[PDB]
Amino acid sequence: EAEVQIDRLITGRLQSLQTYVTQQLIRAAEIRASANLAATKMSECVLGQS
Amino acid sequence: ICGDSTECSNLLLQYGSFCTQLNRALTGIAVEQDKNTQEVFAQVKQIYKTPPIKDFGGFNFSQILPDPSKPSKRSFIEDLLFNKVKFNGLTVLPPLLTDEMIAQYTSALLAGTITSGWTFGAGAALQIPFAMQMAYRFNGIGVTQNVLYENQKLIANQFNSAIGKIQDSLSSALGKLQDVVNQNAQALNTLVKQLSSNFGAISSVLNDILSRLDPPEAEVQIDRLITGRLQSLQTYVTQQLIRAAEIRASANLAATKMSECVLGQSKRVDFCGKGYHLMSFPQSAPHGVVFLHVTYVPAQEKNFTTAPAICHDGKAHFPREGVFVSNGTHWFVTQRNFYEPQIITTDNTFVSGNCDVVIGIVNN
Amino acid sequence: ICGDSTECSNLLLQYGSFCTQLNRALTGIAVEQDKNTQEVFAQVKQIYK
Amino acid sequence: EAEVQIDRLITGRLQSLQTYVTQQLIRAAEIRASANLAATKMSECVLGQS
Amino acid sequence: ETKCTLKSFTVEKGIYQTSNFRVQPTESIVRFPNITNLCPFGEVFNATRFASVYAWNRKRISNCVADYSVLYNSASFSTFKCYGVSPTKLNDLCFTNVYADSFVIRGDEVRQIAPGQTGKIADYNYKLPDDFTGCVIAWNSNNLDSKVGGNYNYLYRLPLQSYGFQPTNGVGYQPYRVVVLSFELLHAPATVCGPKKSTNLVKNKCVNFNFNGLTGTGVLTESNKKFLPFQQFGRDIADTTDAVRDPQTLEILDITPCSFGGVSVITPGTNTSNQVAVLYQGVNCTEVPSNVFQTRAGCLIGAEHVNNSYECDIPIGAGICASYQTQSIIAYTMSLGAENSVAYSNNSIAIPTNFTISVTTEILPVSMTKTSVDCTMY
Amino acid sequence: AYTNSFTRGVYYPDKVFRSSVLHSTQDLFLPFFSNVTWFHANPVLPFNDGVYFASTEKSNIIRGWIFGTTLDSKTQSLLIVNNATNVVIKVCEFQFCNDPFLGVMESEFRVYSSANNCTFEYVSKNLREFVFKNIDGYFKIYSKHTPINLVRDLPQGFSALEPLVDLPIGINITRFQTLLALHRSAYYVGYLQPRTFLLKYNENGTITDAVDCALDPLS
C-alpha cells in the first residue's frame, strides 16, 4: 500500500523539479546575452572610442 | 482546467501552486512586449513637425510623410503595410501604445532626420538645408561634395524614382510579420482543441462524469482529466517563453538599427543595406518596423593603369588622398570611388625618400 | 512510443495532438539549420576565381 | 489488466520525448545566436575593414 | 485582496491582477419532451418464464418514461451494480435506447456478468464489452425455476449441457435470474428520459440550463441561424454547443457565454495613500455588479477622467495611464512629449557656440547565483 | 457494364448544425472515382458494408428493395415497397419469389407468398440516390432526389445526402435485391469502405464540397 501512495509523491515532485530546471535554462540564456553585450561594451567603449 | 465546477476545483488544490507559476510566467512575458516597443520607437524627446512649405532640394518625401486624410494619420506606405498583414479562461490584453501613438513616433523621427540630419540624436536639433546634409553624407562615404552639388538633379530624380518602386513592389513580402501571427494563433488553437480529449477517461465533459458516477468513482476520472489539461497548459507556457526570447532579440536588433541607421550614418558593412549607407527612414508595421535604406552604389567602371608612386627629381611622391592613374599616355590623380582626374602637383602629393626602394615607381 | 504494437496506438490516440506538436517543433529546428548556413556563407553574388 | 500497464509505459515515454524536444529547442536558439555573430563577422571583417 | 495576493503588508506602486469576474447565473430551467408514455418494466422483471443463458433475450426499450427508482429501492434484488453511471443519477439522465437482456444462470456465476471477466459463461454464452455503460440486476429464483427431479430445460453452451436444478441445492447452485440493462447513445435527437420533475424556460439572463441531457450555463437568445432540420443543435468552430433546439417548441436558440474577465487593482502605494481604483478587463461597464469610465481595456472604477495629458505613470492600456495627482486617482491619454517645429529653410543653419561634458551610467547583469539540487534527496 | 462515379455518395455523418468549417471525419464512404456496377431493365447482390444506390427515370420502375441474409423463411428480413399509393416498410419472415416483382387492371405484387411473425410494420428525368447502412441493430437510410436533365445516365457533380429514416430492428443482413414494375399494357450499386474525408460546410450549414484524402498525394 505504501507504494501506491509513494508513487504519487514521486510523480508530483519530479514534475516540480523539471519545471524549475527548464525555467532556469531559459533564464541563463538571457543572462548570457547580457554578458556578451557587456563584454562588447567593455571592448568598444573602455578600450577604444566608438 | 475545471470550468467553474467545485468538484474539480477542490481536487486541483492538491497540486500546490502550479497555476500561480503559470500566471507569473505569462505576466512576465506580457510586460516585456510593451518594453520591446518602447525601446524601438521612443528614441526622441520632442515630437518634431515638418515645415509647411517643403522644398528639400528636389527630393520628394510625400509617400512617407504623414497624410491627414488617411486613417490614424499614417503615411501612404504605412497604409499598404497595415492592409497586407472571448472564450474559456483565455483573454488578450491590449498594447500600451496604440497604433496612432507609434505612427506619431515614426513621424517625429522622420521629421527630425529630414530637417536636422543626425544632430537631434546627439542633443538639440540644428537645422541644415537638405542638400548640404546630403553633401555631408557623401563626404562620409569618401566622395567629395562637388560630386553631389554638380549632380543634384540627377541624384534627386534617382531617389524619387526609387521611392516610387517600393510603393509598387508592396502594392502588388511581409512574411516575417505574418509568421509570428500564424505561430501564436496555431498555438492558441491547439490549446483549446485539447479541451476535448479524454486522456483515458470516460468522457471529456465534467457534467458527464458528475452524472453517471458516484463521487468515489468520479474522483479517479476527474484526476485523469486534470493531469492531461495541466500538461497541455504547461506545454503552452514553455513554448511561449521560448518564442518570446526570440522576439526579444529581434526587437533588440531593431532598436540598434534605429540608433545606428536612422539617427546616424553607419560605416559597418551590410548593416544598413547593401552599398554605402547614406541614410535610413523608419515606417511602422503591424507588430514591427520597416526600414527604408538609401545607399550609394558605384557604376560604369573603366580600367586604367596604376603606379604606387611617381619619381621626380630623385624623389618619390605619393598621393595625399587618391590614386595615380594613366589614360594610356598621361598621369593624373583621382579620388578612389569616382573618376575625376587632376594634374599631379605638389599640392595633392607628398614626398618621402628616394625613388629606388618602392617597386613599381614610374617616371613623370 | 508504441512501436509496432496496435494496442498502444489506440490508447495513445486518446492524448490529442501531443505528437503533432512535437513533430512541428522538430521540423522548425531542421529548417532553421539550413538558413543558418545560407546566411553565413551565401554572401556573394558571383563565384569569383 | 494490460491497458493499465500500457498507460504507465506511454506516460513515461511521452515525458522523455518532451524533455528531449524542449532541450533541442533551447539548444538551437544558442546555435542561431552564434550563426548570427558569424554572419556579422563575415560581412564586417571579410567584406570590409573594421 | 492585493495584499493577500502578494503576501505582504506593503504594496509598491504598480498594477496587480487580483482575481476574476464571473457573472454568476440565476434561475435554472429544464426542458424535457411532452412526457406521457410510461414504461411497464413489469414484463421483463415480471415474466412467468425466463430465457436460456445461451440464447438470451433482447428487448429494446424505447421512447418512454423510465423510473429506475422503483428498481433501485425495491430491495428484492440480490445484486444491483451500475458501471457507467451510479444508480441514483439514472432518474436524471436521457439516452437514445435502452436494451434489456434476460436469462437464467447458477448462483455463483453472477460474478461473470461484468466487464472484463472469464469463465464458461462470459467466454461463450454472453459477453459484456469492456466499456459497459448500463447496470446489472440479479435475484434468486429458486422457487420458480427449480423443480423436484431436476429441471433439465435450462441449458448452457460449454456442445450444450443442462443445469439440473433441484430445490434441495445449496445456495450458489440455485437458479438466479439476471437482467442486464444497457443504455446506449447513438447520434439521434433524443429518447427515453426520467420523471423529469417538471420544467420551465426563459431567455436573456445568465442561466443554468439542461436541454434533455445537455447541461450548461449561459445566456439564451433567439437562434436566428439557418439551422436546418433533421438536427438537434450545432456546435460550430472549436466544437462548442453554441446553439440548441428546444424539444417542446422546436426552435433554435444560441448560447453565447456568460460575461467574465480579470480584475486588476491600481494603487499609488500604501506609503502614499490607501485609495484604490479597479479595472474590470474587457468587460462592458454596465454589467459590473462615483466614477465609472469606459476604456478600450475594460471598465475603470474609482478614477476620474481628465482632459490634460501627462507622462505615463501607471499603464492601463490602449494609450491610457493613471496617476495619483488630482489626493485621488485619474485617467488620461499619456503624452508622447512636447512639440517642436524646427526652423527649416533652404539657406539657414544652426551652429553651436559652447558645449557640455556629460557623464551617465549604464548597468548590466553579468552573472547569477550558482545553485545545485540533488535530485534524489529532493 | 461498369461506370465511374465522380464525387457521389456523401451524406451528413449526423445531426449537429455547422457552417464554413473544413471538418474532418472518419466513416464509411463511397471512395471518389469508383467502379460502380451498371444494371439495365434483377439479381441477388451482397451487402457486406453499406450500399450506395442511384436510379434514373420519369416513370417509377424502381419500387423498393428487399434485404436480409436468406431472403426467405427460417430467418427474418426487411421489405421496403411502394405501390402507386405510398411506402410500406415491413419486417416479417417471408417467402420471397426467387424473381419477385410487381405488375402494372394495374394488378401486381408477385413479390412474396408469406408474411409470418411480423415484428415491425408501417404503412401510409429524375435521379434518386440512397445510402443504406446497418449498425448496432439500427438500419439507417440516407437519400437525395436531384433532377437530371438527362433520362437514364449517371451524371457528374456534388450533392450531399440527408438522413431519412432510423429503424431499431436488430436484423442481420448479408444480401439484398431490387423490385421493378413489369410491362403488361437503369441503376447502379456501389459499396462503402472506411475512409477519411474533409467536408466543406457552407454558412447555412450544408456540405458543398469534399476531399477524399486517400485518392492521390495532392489530396
Ligand SMILES: *[C@@H]1O[C@H](CO)[C@@H](O[C@@H]2O[C@H](CO)[C@@H](O)[C@H](O)[C@H]2NC(C)=O)[C@H](O)[C@H]1NC(C)=O
Ligand atoms: C511628389 O511625388 C508625388 C507622387 O507620388 C506627387 O504627387 C502626385 O502627382 C501626380 C502627378 O501630377 C498627381 O496626379 C497626384 O494627384 C499627386 N498627388 C498624390 C498622388 O497624392 C507630388 O506632386 C510630388 N511633389 C512635388 C513637389 O513635385
Ligand SMILES: *[C@@H]1O[C@H](CO)[C@@H](O[C@@H]2O[C@H](CO)[C@@H](O)[C@H](O)[C@H]2NC(C)=O)[C@H](O)[C@H]1NC(C)=O
Ligand atoms: C578591363 O580590362 C580587361 C582586360 O582585357 C577586360 O577583361 C577582359 O574582357 C574580355 C572581353 O570582355 C574577356 O574576353 C576577357 O576574358 C577579360 N579578361 C582578361 C582579358 O583577362 C575588362 O573587360 C576591362 N574592364 C572594363 C570595365 O573595361
Ligand SMILES: *[C@@H]1O[C@H](CO)[C@@H](O[C@@H]2O[C@H](CO)[C@@H](O)[C@H](O)[C@H]2NC(C)=O)[C@H](O)[C@H]1NC(C)=O
Ligand atoms: C589622355 O588625356 C589627355 C587629356 O589631358 C589627352 O590629351 C589631350 O587631348 C586633347 C583632345 O584630344 C588635346 O586637345 C590635347 O592637346 C591633348 N593634350 C593635352 C596635354 O591636353 C590624351 O589624348 C588622352 N589619351 C588617351 C589615350 O585617351
Ligand SMILES: *[C@@H]1O[C@H](CO)[C@@H](O[C@@H]2O[C@H](CO)[C@@H](O)[C@H](O)[C@H]2NC(C)=O)[C@H](O)[C@H]1NC(C)=O
Ligand atoms: C627614370 O628616370 C631616371 C633618371 O632620369 C632613369 O635613370 C637613368 O636610367 C638610364 C638608363 O637605365 C641610365 O643610363 C642612367 O644612368 C640613369 N640615371 C640615374 C640618375 O639613375 C631611369 O632609368 C628612369 N626609369 C625608366 C624606367 O626609364
Ligand SMILES: *[C@@H]1O[C@H](CO)[C@@H](O[C@@H]2O[C@H](CO)[C@@H](O)[C@H](O)[C@H]2NC(C)=O)[C@H](O)[C@H]1NC(C)=O
Ligand atoms: C412485479 O409485479 C409484482 C406484483 O404486481 C410487484 O410486487 C409488488 O411489490 C411491491 C413493493 O415490493 C409490494 O408492495 C407489492 O405488494 C407487490 N405486489 C403484490 C401483488 O403483492 C413487483 O414490484 C413487480 N416487479 C417490478 C420490478 O416492478
Ligand SMILES: *[C@@H]1O[C@H](CO)[C@@H](O[C@@H]2O[C@H](CO)[C@@H](O)[C@H](O)[C@H]2NC(C)=O)[C@H](O)[C@H]1NC(C)=O
Ligand atoms: C407538447 O405539448 C404542448 C402542450 O402540452 C404543445 O404546445 C402547443 O403548441 C401549439 C403550437 O403549435 C399551440 O398552438 C398550442 O396551444 C400548445 N398547447 C398548449 C397547451 O400550450 C407542444 O406543441 C407539444 N410539443 C410538440 C413538439 O408539439
Ligand SMILES: *[C@@H]1O[C@H](CO)[C@@H](O)[C@H](O)[C@H]1NC(C)=O
Ligand atoms: C609586374 O609583372 C611583370 C610581368 O609581366 C614584371 O615584368 C614587372 O616587373 C612586375 N611589376 C611589379 C611592380 O610587380
Ligand SMILES: *[C@@H]1O[C@H](CO)[C@@H](O)[C@H](O)[C@H]1NC(C)=O
Ligand atoms: C515611504 O515612507 C517613508 C517614511 O514613511 C518616506 O520617507 C518615503 O518618502 C516614502 N516613500 C514614498 C514614495 O512616498
Ligand SMILES: *[C@@H]1O[C@H](CO)[C@@H](O)[C@H](O)[C@H]1NC(C)=O
Ligand atoms: C455596453 O452596452 C451598451 C448597451 O448595448 C452599449 O451601448 C455600449 O456600446 C456597450 N459598450 C461598448 C464598449 O460598446
Ligand SMILES: *[C@@H]1O[C@H](CO)[C@@H](O)[C@H](O)[C@H]1NC(C)=O
Ligand atoms: C474634454 O474636452 C472635450 C472637448 O471635446 C469636452 O467635450 C469635454 O467635456 C472635456 N472633458 C471634461 C471632463 O471637461
Ligand SMILES: *[C@@H]1O[C@H](CO)[C@@H](O)[C@H](O)[C@H]1NC(C)=O
Ligand atoms: C471494374 O472492375 C472490373 C473487374 O474486372 C474491370 O474489368 C473494370 O475495367 C473496372 N472498371 C473500371 C472503370 O476501372
Ligand SMILES: *[C@@H]1O[C@H](CO)[C@@H](O)[C@H](O)[C@H]1NC(C)=O
Ligand atoms: C399498397 O401495398 C400495401 C402493402 O401491404 C397495402 O397494405 C396497401 O393496401 C396497398 N395499397 C392499396 C391501395 O391497396
Ligand SMILES: *[C@@H]1O[C@H](CO)[C@@H](O)[C@H](O)[C@H]1NC(C)=O
Ligand atoms: C415464427 O413462426 C413459426 C411458424 O409460423 C412459429 O413456429 C414460431 O413460433 C414463430 N416465432 C415465434 C417467436 O413465435
Ligand SMILES: *[C@@H]1O[C@H](CO)[C@@H](O)[C@H](O)[C@H]1NC(C)=O
Ligand atoms: C448475425 O450473424 C452472426 C454470424 O456470425 C451471428 O454471430 C450474430 O449473432 C448475428 N446477429 C445477431 C444479432 O444475432
Ligand SMILES: *[C@@H]1O[C@H](CO)[C@@H](O)[C@H](O)[C@H]1NC(C)=O
Ligand atoms: C443560404 O446560403 C445562401 C448562399 O450561401 C445565402 O445567400 C442565403 O441567405 C442562405 N439562406 C437561405 C437561402 O435561407
